[model samples]
Target: SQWKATFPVDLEIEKNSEMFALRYIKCASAFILDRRGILDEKCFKTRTIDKLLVTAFQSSVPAAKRVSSTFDGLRDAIQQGYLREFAIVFYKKPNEEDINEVFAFRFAYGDEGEIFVSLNNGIDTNESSQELLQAKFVDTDNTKQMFASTIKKLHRCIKKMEPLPQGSDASFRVSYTEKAPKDYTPEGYLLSPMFYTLNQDIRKASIGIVCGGHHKIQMLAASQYLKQDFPNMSPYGLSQGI
Candidate 1:
C-alpha cells in the first residue's frame, strides 16, 4: 500500500510513561522521496536502496529545517541517525506555539531500525509500530491527473523549505489533502511516481498527498521561556516541577 506505516497526524507519539513529557511536544514531521525517479529505474538492486535514500533525505534537509520548531533538536536527531536511516526520510516542521517540542520518526538501516528523537525541545532508542492508512484508488485518466497534481503540490513543498530569518515569528505550515489513484495513461503515468507499486506492476495505486495548507504562524514568547528554563525532567518529576 502507498500509505503503509504512514499517518495523517504530523507525528504520532507513542503512549508511554517515558514519552509522557513529549505529549505536549509540538514539532511536525513528513517524509520526502522521489517516487518517480525510483519507478523509472529499470534494474533496481536491493543493496543500492540505502544509497538512494541517503541522497534524497540529505537533499531535503534545508526544507525540514524551515519547519523545525527548534532547529537544534532537528539537527541532533539527524546527526545521531545514519552515522545510523528511512527510505521515506522523516523531517520536522516548526511549530507556531512551542519551538522546543519533541518529535520521533523511524530510521532503518542494515537490519536494525531506530527512532531518532528530536529534543532540542529535549530524546530515542527503540520505538512502536505505526498505524497504517487505507489506500483508495480506482483506475481512470482522471485519477492520473489527480496523482500528477498532488505530486506536483508535494514538490512545491521542497521549494518552501528555505529557512526564515532569525527572530522572525513566521514559518511554513502544511495541511494535507487525501487523494486517491484512479486513471492512468502511458506517458502521464511515467512522470507521476505514485502510480506504480513496489513490485513494478501497473495496478491500483496508493494515496496521494497535496501540501495545501500553508501560512505564517504567529509567534509566542512563552514558548522560549519553557525551553530555556525547563530542565530535562522525568514524567513524574514534570508533574511536581509544574
Candidate 2:
C-alpha cells in the first residue's frame, strides 16, 4: 500500500484527445515492488494512448479485445469518482526449472525475447501431444506464490479508494487465489492475464472495459516514465497487455 503519488497532475482527458474512449480519465499511477517485497523502488516508464489501445486489439485474446469497448465506462467511473479499487497484474506463465521465466527472458533478451526453437526430432513424437497440454496450463503455483505477497501489500495500499454513483453498484474482482473453470479460460493457452475490477456482479464485459482504461493510462505513464528514468532497462513489464 506504499503507492506514492508519482504523477499527481489532473489530466483534462476530455479536452485533450480525439479518442472518445479516453475522455473521462483524470489520472493514473504505476506500482512496483522489489524482490524483498519493499515498495521503495519507483517505476519510470511511459506510453501513449494510441499505442495502448492498439496493443490490446493486436492480440487475439477475447478478454483483451473487450477492453476497447468498455474503456469509456471504466474511465468515467474513475474520473467521476465512482470506482473504488482495481489491479491489473501483467503476469506470464513462467518457464519454471526453478527460476522464473519472466526474469530470465527479460534479463537475457529484453522485453521481446523468445527462446523456443522450432526443430522437431521424430524420436520425440510425443511433442505434438505436449503442445496441446501447453494449451491447458493457465498458470502455475510458482507464479501465484510470487505475486501472492505483492497482492497482500497492494491490498493495504489500495484499501484507500473513492465513492460511486447511486445504483451504480460498482465493484471489482481479483483472480489470483481462485481460478475459474476451464470453460471460462480464454484462448491463447500460454497467455493468461488476470485482472481485478470493481463491480457488484461477475461481469466479464464490465471488467474488460475498466481494465482497458486502467491499463492504457498505466502503461502510457509507465512507458514514458521509463524512457526518462531508466532508458537502458526495457519497460517490458509495464508495456505488456493484460
Candidate 3:
C-alpha cells in the first residue's frame, strides 16, 4: 500500500543555522594539534566560540537561571568525545503567525583528532510539536556535500552512542497511505488528498524514540541528517519521525 506521512513543520533551516553558526564560530577559535604544522591558524583565530556560546545561552536559558545547568554536562561530553557541545535557540517566526524556529550548534572531534562544525535549522511543518537544530564543521573541499555527508555520519554515530532505555520499543513503524471513503468520517475531519493518516505502528515508533530516554546526541545527529538529505524540507519534519 502507498503510504504518506505528515508532520507539523520543517526544522532543517533553523537547526542548521544553530549548529553551523556555533560550530563554525567555535572551531574557528579552536587550537588543535595537527601533523601538518597546526593546520589553519587563521581560520581558528577568526571564529569566536566564546561569543557564540554566550549568545546562545542567553536565548535558550530562562532568566530564572542565569547559568545553564547543561553547560558543564555538555562541555564534559565534548571533551570526552561522547557528545559535542552546542547551543540551540527557539523562537516564533515574525512573519508566520504561529511558526516556531529552533537552532543548534555542535562541535565534534574526529578520531583523527580533527574538529568540525555542523550548522542547520530544524523547522518542519507547523504540525510538528518538537524540533532540533544543529551546527557542525568538517574539513572538506566541498562545503555543501560535506554538510550532507557529515549529517549522515553523525546520525550513525549517535545511534551507536546510546541505547534506548528499558521498556522501550525497538524500532520505528512505517506509515501507509490510503484514501478514506467520503462517508468515512466528518467531511473536514477526513483525510486530505495530500496526506495520509498516521497508523498505530508509526505512533509506536515515535514513542519508542522519545520515551527511550535522553538521547541528546542521537537526536541532534538525526536533525543534521534531515537537513542534509532534504535541503528544502523543514527541520520540523524530523520531529515527527522521532
- Tell me which of candidates 2 and 3 scores higher on lDDT: 3
Worst 10 residues of 1 by lDDT: 233-242
**Model 1 RMSD to the real structure?**
21.8
CA lDDT, every model vs. true structure: 0.21, 0.21, 0.23
Q: Against the hidden reference, what TM-scores do the models get? A: 0.19, 0.21, 0.22
> Number of the top candidate by TM-score?
3
Instruction: Please provide, for model 1 over 1-242, each residue's C-alpha lDDT reduced to its tens digit, 9 standing for 90 to 100.
Output: 12211112221222221121111112112222222121112212111111111111222344332322232232232222211111121112343333322112222212223233323221121122111111122222333334344334433433333332333332211111111122221110121222101211211111232111110111111111121311001100000000
Estimate, for each residue in 56-151, the C-alpha lDDT of model 3 and write its tens digit. Answer: 122232421222232323333333334332323211224222212112232223222323221222222222222222222232223334333433
RMSD of each: 21.8, 21.2, 21.3
Per-residue lDDT for 96-147 in model 2, tens only? 1111101100000011122232142101113322321222212223222222
- Give the TM-score comparing model 3 with the true structure, all chains together: 0.22
Question: Against the true structure, candidate 2 has what lDDT?
Answer: 0.21
